[PDB]
């Protein structure tokens, strides 16, 4: 045949892959964590968005830390041979490096490790996408008025917010980040490479949202999401 290029992931396997959505809204009272109003709006938007991208979506609600780990372990032991990619969306409270089960925290690194190149062989070389709506600390952005491959290769973490910072969720509309992510996927998934989509999400969150609060400490604050890419190829959700 003629000259070939392989700058982009193979996305024409029989299946796009799983989209696991962990929607933690209600937490055990002993944790003292508040209910995450608006997260169901997020979970529904994601389900529909990834459905239209032809992902096999599985929604899970209010999982304990044990259930999260067991789920990730189990999913990582499925046969993904006929799948192009893997997507996991986490909606919860969080801190840097951490997301909360309903009864306590889970290490993000622990979750992604199940899908390591050496630990999930049917996903080796395929894009493994983790989308995380959760705080990463308690900073507020005040804004300004204008042979082998690495086992950690082919991961992408799309964080809702910068490291160290709160992440914002609207109780009526859903979270700024997930709102924006679904909108940009709907508008551009048939047009743009995924980093360029996520860059549009960065701009949308950064420009269109600003907190309103009766509390001066939490009023008029801004947010910028953070793309964490260890991908080795371009990712298009469509194929030729």
């Amino acid at each position: 045949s003629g000259i070939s290029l392989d700058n982009s992931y193979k996305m024409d396997y029989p299946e796009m892959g799983l989209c696991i959505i962990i929607n933690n809204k209600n937490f055990h009272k002993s944790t003292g964590m508040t209910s995450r109003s608006g997260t169901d709006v997020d979970a529904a938007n994601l389900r529909e968005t990834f459905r239209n991208l032809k992902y096999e979506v599985r929604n899970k609600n209010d999982l304990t830390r044990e259930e999260i780990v067991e789920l990730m372990r189990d999913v990582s032991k499925e046969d993904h041979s006929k799948r192009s990619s893997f997507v996991c969306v986490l909606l919860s409270h969080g801190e840097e490096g951490i997301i909360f089960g309903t009864n306590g925290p889970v290490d993000l690194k622990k979750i992604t490790n199940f899908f390591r190149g050496d630990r999930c062989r049917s996903l080796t070389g395929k894009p493994k996408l983790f989308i995380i709506q959760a705080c990463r600390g308690t900073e507020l952005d005040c804004g300004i008025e204008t042979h082998k491959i690495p086992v950690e290769a082919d991961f992408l973490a799309a964080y809702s917010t910068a490291p160290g910072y709160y992440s914002w969720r609207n109780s009526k509309d859903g979270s700024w980040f997930i709102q924006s992510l679904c909108a940009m996927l709907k508008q551009y998934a048939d047009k743009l490479e995924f980093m360029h989509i996520l860059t549009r999400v960065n701009r949308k969150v950064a420009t269109e949202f600003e907190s309103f609060s009766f509390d001066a400490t939490f009023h008029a604050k801004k947010q910028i999401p953070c793309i964490h890419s260890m991908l080795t190829k371009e990712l298009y959700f469509y194929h030729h």
Partner: peptide, 4 residues
Amino acid sequence: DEVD
């Protein structure tokens, strides 16, 4: 608006 609430924080996570």
